[PDB]
Design an enzyme around this catalytic site. Structure first.
Site, PDB file in Angstrom:
ATOM      1  N   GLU A  35      79.088 -10.312 -98.749  1.00  5.35           N
ATOM      2  CA  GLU A  35      77.696 -10.796 -99.078  1.00  5.35           C
ATOM      3  C   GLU A  35      77.379  -9.684-100.174  1.00  5.35           C
ATOM      4  O   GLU A  35      76.890 -10.051-101.252  1.00  5.35           O
ATOM      5  CB  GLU A  35      76.794 -10.939 -97.779  1.00  5.35           C
ATOM      6  N   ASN A  46      69.622 -16.551-108.162  1.00  2.96           N
ATOM      7  CA  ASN A  46      70.067 -17.955-107.911  1.00  2.96           C
ATOM      8  C   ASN A  46      69.419 -18.353-109.189  1.00  2.96           C
ATOM      9  O   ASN A  46      68.715 -17.800-109.880  1.00  2.96           O
ATOM     10  CB  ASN A  46      69.898 -18.312-106.566  1.00  2.96           C
ATOM     11  N   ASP A  48      67.465 -20.898-109.181  1.00  2.00           N
ATOM     12  CA  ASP A  48      66.134 -21.916-108.894  1.00  2.00           C
ATOM     13  C   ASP A  48      64.897 -20.840-108.989  1.00  2.00           C
ATOM     14  O   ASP A  48      63.835 -20.989-108.388  1.00  2.00           O
ATOM     15  CB  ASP A  48      66.255 -22.300-107.638  1.00  2.00           C
ATOM     16  N   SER A  50      64.975 -17.660-107.357  1.00  2.55           N
ATOM     17  CA  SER A  50      65.070 -17.051-106.189  1.00  2.55           C
ATOM     18  C   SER A  50      66.000 -15.818-106.357  1.00  2.55           C
ATOM     19  O   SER A  50      66.840 -15.995-107.335  1.00  2.55           O
ATOM     20  CB  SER A  50      65.269 -17.876-104.850  1.00  2.55           C
ATOM     21  N   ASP A  52      68.342 -12.481-103.902  1.00  2.00           N
ATOM     22  CA  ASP A  52      68.940 -12.465-102.566  1.00  2.00           C
ATOM     23  C   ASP A  52      68.647 -10.855-102.556  1.00  2.00           C
ATOM     24  O   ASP A  52      69.002 -10.059-103.382  1.00  2.00           O
ATOM     25  CB  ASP A  52      70.590 -12.708-102.445  1.00  2.00           C
ATOM     26  N   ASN A  59      66.796 -14.225 -98.748  1.00  6.81           N
ATOM     27  CA  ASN A  59      66.159 -15.048 -99.999  1.00  6.81           C
ATOM     28  C   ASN A  59      64.798 -14.988-100.151  1.00  6.81           C
ATOM     29  O   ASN A  59      64.143 -15.097 -98.909  1.00  6.81           O
ATOM     30  CB  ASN A  59      66.906 -16.487 -99.772  1.00  6.81           C
ATOM     31  N   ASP A 101      66.861 -19.968 -86.318  1.00  7.22           N
ATOM     32  CA  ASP A 101      65.961 -20.687 -86.811  1.00  7.22           C
ATOM     33  C   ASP A 101      66.347 -22.036 -86.574  1.00  7.22           C
ATOM     34  O   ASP A 101      65.933 -23.222 -85.888  1.00  7.22           O
ATOM     35  CB  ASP A 101      65.658 -20.300 -88.281  1.00  7.22           C
TER      36      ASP A 101
END
Length: 129
Positions: A35, A46, A48, A50, A52, A59, A101
């Site tokens: 990761e 990313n 969009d 966003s 990391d 995110n 979640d």
């Protein structure tokens, strides 16, 4: 900071994560390897808009504010930058949330693709734990 296999294990353990919501310690060291390569300073954009953050690549569209992602819900209540610190406390604390979640560790593309269903105990082979 760039952690050792074994040092990160020890630390994630110290921090409440060995079997947290049922994921072996391994599952965690795994996800982090693939990761971020155990590098807490790691960031990735990313498409969009966003980004990391940190060892576990949390995110900014949901978890932390970095003050340049719109849609942004900051469910962690932490500045994304916090997640890059040499102390992983913030990242764990946050990860605990993410994993609870509903989707467990599936929320991490790399875990799902590269860790899920492999002998993850291999990652804490060798460790004083």
């Amino acid at each position: 900071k760039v952690f050792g296999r074994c040092e990160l294990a020890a630390a994630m353990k110290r921090h409440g994560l060995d079997n947290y919501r049922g994921y072996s310690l391994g599952n965690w060291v795994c996800a982090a390897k693939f990761e971020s390569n155990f590098n807490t300073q790691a960031t990735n954009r990313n498409t969009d808009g966003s980004t990391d953050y940190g060892i576990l690549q949390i995110n900014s569209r949901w978890w932390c504010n970095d003050g340049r992602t719109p849609g942004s819900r900051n469910l962690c209540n932490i500045p994304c930058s916090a997640l890059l610190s040499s102390d992983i406390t913030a990242s764990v604390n946050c990860a605990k949330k993410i994993v609870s979640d509903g989707n467990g560790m599936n929320a991490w593309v790399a875990w799902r693709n590269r860790c899920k269903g492999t002998d993850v105990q291999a990652w804490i082979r060798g460790c004083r734990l």
